[PDB]
From a paper:
TRPV3 dysfunction has been associated with numerous skin diseases, including atopic dermatitis, dermal fibrosis, rosacea, and itch, as well as channelopathies like Olmsted syndrome, caused by a growing list of ‘gain-of-function’ mutations. TRPV3 is inhibited by the local anesthetic dyclonine, traditionally used for topical applications to relieve pain and itch. The structure includes an ion channel, which is formed by the transmembrane domains (TMDs) of the four individual subunits, each contributing the S1–S4 and pore domains in a domain-swapped arrangement, and a large intracellular skirt that is mostly formed by the ankyrin-repeat domains (ARDs).
Three-dimensional reconstruction with four-fold rotational symmetry (C4) resulted in a TRPV3Dyc map with overall resolution of 3.16 Å. The overall architecture of TRPV3Dyc is similar to the previously solved TRPV3 structures. We found that dyclonine binds to sites inside the portals which connect the membrane environment to the central cavity of the ion channel pore. To make room for dyclonine in the portal, the side chain of F666 flips around by about 90 degrees and its benzyl group becomes nearly parallel to the piperidine group of dyclonine. However, we think that it is more likely that dyclonine inhibits TRPV3 by binding in the side portals and protruding into the TRPV3 pore’s central cavity, thus creating an additional barrier for ion permeation.
Residue numbers in the entry:
A (entry chain B): 232 to 462, 471 to 610, 622 to 756
B (entry chain A): 579 to 610, 622 to 693
C (entry chain C): 348 to 462
D (entry chain C): 694 to 756
The structure:
């Protein structure tokens, strides 16, 4: 306070390398002003002393283009580390300003403070902004949550959907779903205007477009099976004017419409990672494989190439594996298929590496009492024995009797008592940890489905399926709102903030 | 018995038939057949425990006629059945505290 | 304290920071710089690294008497001193030992199968 | 505990010219003529807000 009232400048900009680091431990990014430093280190009495000065430029931008409200989003962390203070500094600065100039400003990435919290995965700052209710009289247009009416323990609220719905490009609902960097996406889709905005899209159009996509892919595998079982099979190049000729045509057309459509979505999508293929775009590849194998088998046949039956069985056997994709329309069957993924990754792939180490370990090294072509045969006599059938003519025709059990007992002790029973012991541990998360990690799958059905709708049909209602929330402030009802028995207060005196639906 | 048939067994059966009629008709490649009665039956007899290997000897291709027969055994034994036991353990654990009142 | 398995006395000694002015050379943990919520410390490695015989890192690993060895290797200058050895030389010597023993069993199989 | 015994046996089968190249530590000046062989670890702490009096360098940063 001595320095400021002696002529010190309150608008300096630390433009160093230590204040703009490349890595986290090499420095400290705070926002490059004396007001961002007093806020990001929890000093609320110096923040008030700096805003009461008149030379403070509260709407300035640093080297990244950030302002004071972009900078508090960047340094925000969980409850277990910072515990409260960034949420309390956010509205101290916001209410003192008194208008929408800070909240509607765009940095050099072209993002607002609302969209930067969703891009970076801050689920506590974002919970604060979306449901921000200010009940004071002169500053009520700075709210995003209003109260339409109330009577007793019954209320009716109005959220705001200005940048959180998908009517504009680069919105809050779109950013969270397509965000491969962060890892807590299924805890940001349970927040209150976003949970109800996906549930309404599913009941209006998106559960009917998901049934029509299931019928046409069901008929594609039935028709591909019957023309290949009752035998080249396809396209009927010798016209006898046969009725139900569409079956040879429908398979050929629909296999081109998938390969083109998956040729685009593979080309656009690239979050380069090994975790990307196992979680999002597994099925973008394996619908593109099948649509090639149907078309490529037709192109092989036309010269001479004779491999036109290998591809058709591959195209049929893969084409029935893909239909477990369509289980995500039901909560019961959908969560079951989620746990199939966690069991194949975390449990089964490690079992197979240890077993082959004994199967090719014992297998070549059995050719001692009977020799043999051992690598095809003695490996096969240990795999047939594991299926359950067995052929004991080789034990009778051995060099040594009952001693020809020691490599055959040591095989059965390991693969049955030890290795398989430890697989069941680990799947019980794996199911126990994923059962609490399977409801949210399922809803992250279905939310990406809804937002792709919405893109393939014409503009005259987008307008009919649209949420929202024009409300009058202030003097000439018309917003596009979403009404949610509530019953609360624990807080008994008298109601002063309301848009309507007379309650009820009307 | 009621809580296990509803919550666990009916979902297992829908996934298994999807492979049994998936692999079953699509096995008639190295041996062709009346496939839908027979090649489905040679994959269900194999699951019971008996097996008849004269069709593998009388195949068009030897040891390659295991790839559709190995991919059947990996899924139905390692994956699907062992995940049923892992879910019945979760289901018994939740109904054991309520079974005395829901019996009365 | 490392020979006898005392994991609470040993936690005290290895990270002993004395901030007073006349007695600061009795520390084994210093602070190089600090700015806001960001610091950078300097541990001491005089008898806890393997440059001398009978050191603190060697005693804990080869100690068959005690039973809480895996709770004394998570302490703060010792956890990071093993992690750095693995990335510099010890993960490359462990791959070369795996290749040569893999080729020893392949060659022993092929010359014994094709008699 | 298994992997730590592995690292300390690979280190014994190294010649003395190669021990010197793979070696942690840096000579710091921690007091008046007290040079020690130190190991730097960084930290971020949001819960204790104090003013800093003990430090070896006024000017922070990697240098
Ligand atoms: C108002 C009526 C007239 C409106 C017509 C307007 C035209 C609109 C449509 C325009 C074009 C649609 C694009 C499909 C292209 C051809 C097929 C194809 O190859 O794509 C794919 C199928 O995709 C589907 O077939 C889904 C069904 C979409 C049709 C919408 C029905 C009418 C919209 C009214 C809705 C309101 C209903 C509610 C009413 C109460 C094939 O690929 P896939 O494998 O099957 O997909 C899996 C994706 N995967 C690969 C990532 C795993
Ligand atoms: C090309 C076929 C592969 C065959 C071998 C495997 C090689 C690589 C194996 C790697 C093992 C570890 C990774 C597994 C896959 C990733 C995780 C996963 O999604 O699990 C899925 C496995 O669902 C299936 O089983 C069907 C997919 C094809 C597998 C073959 C089945 C029988 C094919 C018959 C013979 C055809 C032979 C092939 C013909 C050339 C389950 O997915 P979900 O959870 O239920 O749905 C949501 C998934 N999501 C969130 C990711 C959207
Ligand atoms: C071929 C038999 C037919 C089976 C179908 C074909 C399979 C083709 C599949 C091929 C690759 C598998 C899919 C991608 C996996 C990536 C990592 C992963 O998710 O695994 C996870 C589980 O931990 C493991 O699964 C360990 C892997 C076992 C090593 C054995 C060799 C390959 C196994 C395959 C077959 C064995 C046969 C061996 C024959 C040589 C690792 O844990 P995480 O959650 O990722 O944590 C991050 C780890 N990180 C920090 C390092 C990043
Ligand atoms: C045929 C084989 C011989 C077997 C004997 C004959 C079986 C004949 C039986 C017929 C119907 C089953 C009895 C009534 C079930 C009603 C709901 C229920 O309790 O299920 C529960 C478990 O979740 C499931 O069980 C999912 C069902 C699996 C779908 C597969 C098709 C039918 C399965 C059958 C066989 C598969 C073969 C597939 C072949 C096509 C759903 O959970 P919930 O506790 O109800 O919670 C409320 C859900 N709700 C909000 C939506 C209301
Ligand atoms: C493209 C993907 C790369 C992998 C290659 C996969 C391709 C196949 C792999 C190896 C095959 C080796 C040669 C056979 C094919 C040559 C054509 C042929 O004439 O054979 C015949 C059999 O053809 C088949 O149907 C294949 C046998 C099983 C079906 C597919 C499973 C094998 C996939 C394993 C790996 C999957 C992927 C691995 C990862 C999951 C077809 O023609 P045919 O002779 O008229 O019919 C015989 C009956 N007759 C003579 C009495 C009439
Ligand atoms: C392989 C063996 C197959 C045999 C069957 C195996 C079955 C399963 C295996 C696999 C299938 C799993 C998913 C497919 C089911 C559809 C998706 C879905 O979620 O169902 C939904 C309904 O579905 C409906 O829409 C009801 C059908 C009547 C109207 C649809 C006609 C077309 C659209 C009309 C306009 C035409 C276009 C415009 C023209 C004017 C589920 O709804 P629900 O069950 O009632 O309630 C559950 C609660 N829930 C909604 C939150 C979930
Ligand atoms: C998915 C990955 C695993 C797949 C399942 C494994 C089994 C796959 C099953 C079959 C794979 C091959 C298919 C054709 C069948 C044999 C033909 C052949 O060429 O084999 C050759 C190799 O056989 C030998 O030379 C025997 C000596 C052992 C080889 C080296 C040891 C391997 C162990 C370490 C391996 C490193 C990896 C270990 C991983 C931890 C020669 O065969 P042959 O001796 O002359 O007799 C048969 C020839 N005949 C048919 C014409 C009569
Ligand atoms: C409880 C529900 C499941 C029940 C268990 C399933 C197995 C039930 C077992 C037997 C059921 C029938 C009893 C009689 C046996 C055969 C006679 C017959 O009419 O079959 C006909 C169909 O066979 C074909 O046409 C083959 C082509 C595949 C059909 C379509 C694919 C089905 C997959 C998707 C299915 C959608 C539902 C999928 C659900 C996810 C003709 O047979 P065929 O080819 O001429 O040769 C046999 C004739 N013979 C005996 C006179 C020689
Ligand atoms: C048309 C047939 C439909 C019968 O559908 C099923 C057949 C077999 C199974 C099994 O689970 C096989 C039993 N199996 C259990 C483990 C040990 C050996 C026997 C389940 C459903
Ligand atoms: C080249 C063959 C590779 C196949 O690699 C496996 C073979 C068998 C198994 C099994 O698990 C055997 C199934 N077994 C399960 C318990 C009851 C009876 C059947 C796993 C992997």
């Amino acid at each position: 306070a001595v320095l400021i009232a002696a002529g010190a400048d309150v608008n300096a900009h630390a433009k160093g390398v230590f204040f703009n680091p490349k890595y986290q431990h090499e420095g400290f990014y705070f926002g490059e002003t004396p007001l961002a430093l007093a806020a990001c280190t929890n000093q609320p009495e110096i923040v008030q002393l700096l805003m009461e000065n008149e030379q403070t430029d509260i709407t300035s931008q640093d080297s990244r283009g950030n302002n004071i409200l972009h900078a508090l989003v960047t340094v925000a962390e969980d409850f277990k580390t910072q515990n409260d203070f960034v949420k309390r500094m956010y509205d101290m600065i916001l209410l003192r300003s008194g208008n929408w100039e800070l909240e509607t400003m765009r940095n050099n990435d072209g993002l607002t403070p609302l969209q930067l919290a969703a891009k970076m995965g801050k689920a506590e700052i974002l919970k604060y902004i979306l449901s921000r209710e200010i009940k004071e009289k002169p500053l009520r247009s700075l709210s995003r949550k209003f109260t339409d009416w109330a009577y007793g323990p019954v209320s009716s609220s109005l959220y705001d959907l200005t940048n959180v719905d998908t009517t504009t490009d680069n919105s809050v609902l779109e950013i969270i779903v397509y965000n491969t960097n962060i890892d807590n996406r299924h805890e940001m889709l349970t927040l209150e205007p976003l949970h109800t905005l996906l549930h309404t899209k599913w009941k209006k159009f998106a559960k009917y477009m998901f049934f029509l996509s299931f019928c046409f892919y069901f008929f594609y595998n039935i028709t591909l099976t019957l023309v290949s079982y009752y035998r080249h099979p396809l396209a009927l190049t010798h016209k006898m004017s046969w009725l139900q000729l569409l079956g040879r045509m429908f398979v050929l057309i629909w296999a081109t419409c998938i390969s083109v459509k998956e040729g685009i979505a593979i080309f656009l999508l690239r979050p380069s990672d090994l975790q990307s293929i196992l979680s999002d775009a597994w099925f973008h590849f394996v619908f593109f494989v099948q649509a090639v194998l149907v078309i490529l088998s037709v192109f092989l046949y036309l010269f001479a190439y004779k491999e036109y039956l290998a591809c058709l069985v591959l195209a049929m056997a893969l084409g029935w594996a893909n239909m477990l994709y369509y289980t995500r329309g039901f909560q019961s069957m959908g969560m079951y298929s989620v746990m199939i993924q966690k069991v194949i990754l975390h449990d089964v792939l490690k079992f197979l590496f240890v077993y082959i180490l004994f199967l090719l370990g014992f297998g070549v090294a059995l050719a001692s009492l009977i020799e043999y072509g051992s690598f095809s045969d003695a490996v096969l006599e240990l795999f047939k024995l594991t299926i359950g059938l067995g052929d004991l003519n080789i034990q009778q025709n051995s060099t040594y009797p009952i001693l020809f059990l020691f490599l055959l007992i040591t095989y059965v002790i390991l693969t049955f008592v030890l290795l398989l029973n430890m697989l069941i012991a680990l799947m019980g541990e794996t199911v126990e940890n994923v059962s609490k998360e399977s409801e949210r990690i399922w809803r992250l799958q279905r939310a990406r489905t809804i937002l792709e059905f919405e893109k393939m709708l014409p503009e005259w049909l987008r307008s009919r399926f649209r949420m929202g209602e024009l409300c009058k929330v202030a003097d000439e402030d018309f917003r596009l709102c979403l009404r949610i009802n509530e019953v609360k028995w624990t807080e008994w207060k008298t109601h002063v903030s309301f848009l309507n005196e007379d309650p009820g639906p009307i």
